Structures are given as C-alpha cells and as structure tokens.
Amino acid sequence: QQTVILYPSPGVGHIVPMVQLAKVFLRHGCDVTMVIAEPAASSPDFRIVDLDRVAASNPAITFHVLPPVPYADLAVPGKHHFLLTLQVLRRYNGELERFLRSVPRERLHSLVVGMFCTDAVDVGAKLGVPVYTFFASAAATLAVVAQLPALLSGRRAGLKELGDTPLQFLGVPPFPASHLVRELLEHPDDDELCKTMVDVWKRCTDGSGVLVNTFESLESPAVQALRDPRCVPGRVLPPVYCVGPLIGERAAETRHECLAWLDEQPENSVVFLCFGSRCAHSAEQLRGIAVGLERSGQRFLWSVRTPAALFPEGFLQRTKDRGLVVRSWAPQVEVLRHPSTGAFMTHCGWNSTLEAITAGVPMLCWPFYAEQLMNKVFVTEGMGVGVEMEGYTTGFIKSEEVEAKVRLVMESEEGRHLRGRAVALKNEAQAALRDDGPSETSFARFLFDAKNL
Ligand SMILES: O=c1ccn([C@@H]2O[C@H](COP(=O)(O)OP(=O)(O)O)[C@@H](O)[C@H]2O)c(=O)[nH]1
C-alpha cells in the first residue's frame, strides 16, 4: 500500500486544488500525506487556509507540517512577499528530505510538488522517488513558462520595454507583453525577484512529469505544444497529464445566507462578484461598482472585503429585493454552479476561472496580479467566455463601464451567445470528469507511468 507525498505551494489557489488531487489518489487506492511548508508569518498567504479545519474535513489524508526554518535574516524591509516566499521554500528542502527519509522507502509512490516548490525535485531525484509538478495554472501558462527562458536569453532590457506589443508563444493565444506576470517584465539581471521566479518556475518541467489542473479540450493547442519538439529546442519535455478540472463560523453563516437567497432567484439571473482569496478594491472603487451594479437593474450577490462608507447612501435598501451583499468570504464554488447564477465578475485567478468554466458561467474579467491578466486574455480572446472591463489596467473602472458590461452579458444578444459558449465549455468539463473520461484516463496514465519509474 503506497503513499503519495503532496507538497503544495502556499496559498488557497495551491492548497485547495491539491486537496482535490488528494481525493483522486485516494479513489485510486493510494494513501496520501500532504506536507505543509508554512511561508513567513508576514506572507499574505500565511495560514490563509485553516489546516486544522482541512484535516478534520479530510480525515483519510495525513497532514504533516514541516518544522520551521530560519528566515528572519531574509525578512528585510521592503522585500516583495513573494521573493521572501521563494527563498523560504528553498530553505525547507532539508526538512523535506528529513521527512521523506523517515518514510519506509518502499512505500513512496511519488512526490508531487507545487509549481513554486520545484527545487524539491533535487530531493526526490536523490532518493530515487519520481517527482511531478502539480501545475495549478492553465496549460497555456505552462507553455509560456517553458518558453520564457528562450525569450529572455537574448535580451538586454526587460519585457516592459515592449509595452502592449503582443507576445507569441507556441500553443498560446497572443497576449500583450504588459499582461505577462508583472514581476517578469523586469530584466532578470536587474531584479532578483524576476531572476528567482523564472529560475524556480521554469523547473516545473525538470521532474518525471507535470499534472496540470485543466482539461485537454479546453487548451488543446497548448497541450500539443508541450509535446512538440520545437517547444523548447534541444530539450524533450516530460509527460504532461491534464487531470482537471479539480474543483474544491462567520463564514458558515455567510454561506448559509448566500445559498438560501440564491435558491429564491430566477434561473441565470444573478451577477456574482468575488475577487480571489486576497484581492481588495479601494473604497472609492467599491462605491463605483455599487453604482454600476444598481444602475444595471440586475440581480447580484456581492462578496466584499473591507478596503485594503463602502456604498452610496441607501444602496443596500434600494437593492434589497434584487441584491445581496456579504462580507469577506463567500461559498464561491457553490454559488457558481447554482442555476440562479448568470455571470461572474472575477479577478481571473485560475481556480476561479476553472470554477466558472465548469459551471458554465460567463465572466466579467477584472485581473489584478500574478497570471490573472494572461487568464483574462485567454478567457476573453481564446475561449470567448468572458468580457473585458475597460480601465482594468488604469487603477479605476468607471460606473458607466460596470453597468455597460453587466448589461452586455445579462441582456444583450452578444451576451446570450457568450453564455451559450460558456455552457458548451461546461459540457466539455463534465465530459472530462466522467467515469472513464479524459481526465480519469489521464490520471490513470500518470499512475502507470509513475509505478513503472
Ligand atoms: O470569497 C471567496 C474568495 C475565493 N474563494 C476561493 O478561493 C480560490 C481562489 O483561487 P484563485 O486561483 O482563483 O485565485 P487566488 O486567490 O490564488 O488569487 C478559489 O478556489 C475560490 O473559489 C472562495 O471560495 N470564496
């Protein structure tokens, strides 16, 4: 009876899909231990998932928190929190190796690492254990990451010099250079975060294979590119397996309020607004959204974080028969699949994008950071299941644009065709997940390959 070791990167978007991956391993007769490397206590992702609650919810998974590593020396004023996180994660590889040596060797099936824990491949390599990266982003994003070394090698300036000039990667929709992850727009030699982030992320292909949280029919060109010898000249990439979509007190009350209210709304009527595990609009922006939402006349369910006075006077009273505003953390997956939900105003994180795709809900795209601006292009231009919200790169989206785009998705003929394409993709997501469907077949091919290694 073998044990898979799951070793996620920090953050809701890395841990939540890994828990779902764990359930797949369990369904296939593996034991699971999920090894948790906590970031620095100053990380916005520090204990953002309540692991005590997660363990209680999944008693068949063994959860193991690694002993802490020193980092105060690195925690200098002004350091980008993600640079500190990348450095801290490299420092955990000693504790990870001590833990892995504590497990009877013959019982180890594989090591599956998050996409910012890739240096742990050296630990599995040394122990003779197959290592896989769990890539929690799109397959197109993986295809970009694989091709970024070649793009950056000849350069004497950062990609910021290109402005909105399109970047072209094999298998990937063109997207403006400015929409690349922002930190990668600096010259690698000029910015430690750029160099470190590229050096870490690029190693997702240095193991035995990659488990991607996507379904092949959503991203067929990107999956083809990853198997194409030109993708990374002079290199054969390991196997890529599309195994998704893998979708997973005060919050308990909020969830109850949300779903009971949605149950009383007409089908496809509600605009849901929810912006990631940690994005927050300014107070001024929240007011602007509220005015556009009210003006649109549509029903809405709006998850609001306190900025990091919110609404016009009387906004809540006037909208009480068509809208519900809740605080801070909403049951997003259950809202998205609710038949009353008709649109999703999103920050375009990949889990959120997959959740909406799998539910058949068209998107109003408001990307903030990470690869969210890339996801926005993939959703609006590649997939065609969302719309842009003008001003998203400028620091303020006007109430006129909020109303215009809510009405476009919810009332216009263009919106109806958009919804129809979203429903088609939902159907494909469901096909991917059916018994003996593509994502089970892919997971089975991964299990065969890992056993044979
Ligand atoms: O109020 C909220 C905000 C976020 N989420 C979940 O938080 C995840 C966010 O992950 P994503 O990759 O979209 O973006 P990130 O937070 O990493 O930027 C998703 O699974 C959402 O369903 C949620 O359930 N309720």
> What are the domain boundaries of the chain?
1-244+435-453, 256-434
Shortest CA distance to 183 belongs to which of 169, 199, 204, 172?
199
The tokens for 216 are: 């092949």
CA 336, 412, 366: angle at the middle one, nearest 5? 50
> Which contiguous run of DSSP H or E holds residue 304?
strand 299-304
List all residues whose CB is within 6 A of at least one atom of ligand 1.
Answer: 11-13, 16, 274, 276-278, 303, 329-330, 332-333, 349-352, 355
Helices and strands in the chain: count of H runs, count of E runs:
17, 15
Q: Which residue has the tokens 């060109």?
A: 221
- Distance from residue 51's CA to the centre of ligand 1 (Å): 16
Q: Is 264 annotated as a binding residue?
A: no
Atom in ligand 1 nearest the alpha carbon of residue 346: 13
Query: How far apart, in Å, are the Cα atoms of 34 and each of 37, 43, 200, 380, 447?
Result: 10, 20, 21, 35, 18
Q: What three-state secondary structure class fits 338?
A: coil
Is the C-alpha dihedral spanning 292, 298, 304, 309 positive or negative? positive
The tokens for 453 are: 């290694």
Q: Which residue has the tokens 């709006």?
A: 302
Instruction: Kindly report the number of other CB atoms within 10 A of residue 333's CB atom.
Output: 18
End-to-end CA distance of the chain: 17
CA distance 182 to 248: 28
Experimentally, the structure was elucidated by: X-ray
| Torsion angle of C-alpha atoms 187, 396, 359, 349, degrees rounded to 10 | 20
Declared resolution, Å: 1.6
| Torsion angle of C-alpha atoms 45, 46, 48, 52, degrees rounded to 10 | 150
- Distance from residue 334's CA to the centre of ligand 1 (Å): 12
CA distance 94 to 98: 6
CA 344, 350, 355: angle at the middle one, nearest 5? 50
Half-sphere exposure of 86 (CA within 13 A, CB side): 18
Q: Is 296 annotated as a binding residue?
A: no
CA distance 233 to 245: 30
Query: How far apart, in Å, are the Cα atoms of 114 and each of 21, 86, 265, 316, 353?
Result: 12, 12, 39, 42, 19
Q: Which residues contact 264 (CB under 8 A, 6 or more apart)?
A: none
- Distance from residue 179's CA to the centre of ligand 1 (Å): 20
CA distance 139 to 129: 25
Q: Which of 332, 336, 368, 374 to mutate to test the pocket of ligand 1 (most atoms within 8 A of CB)?
A: 332
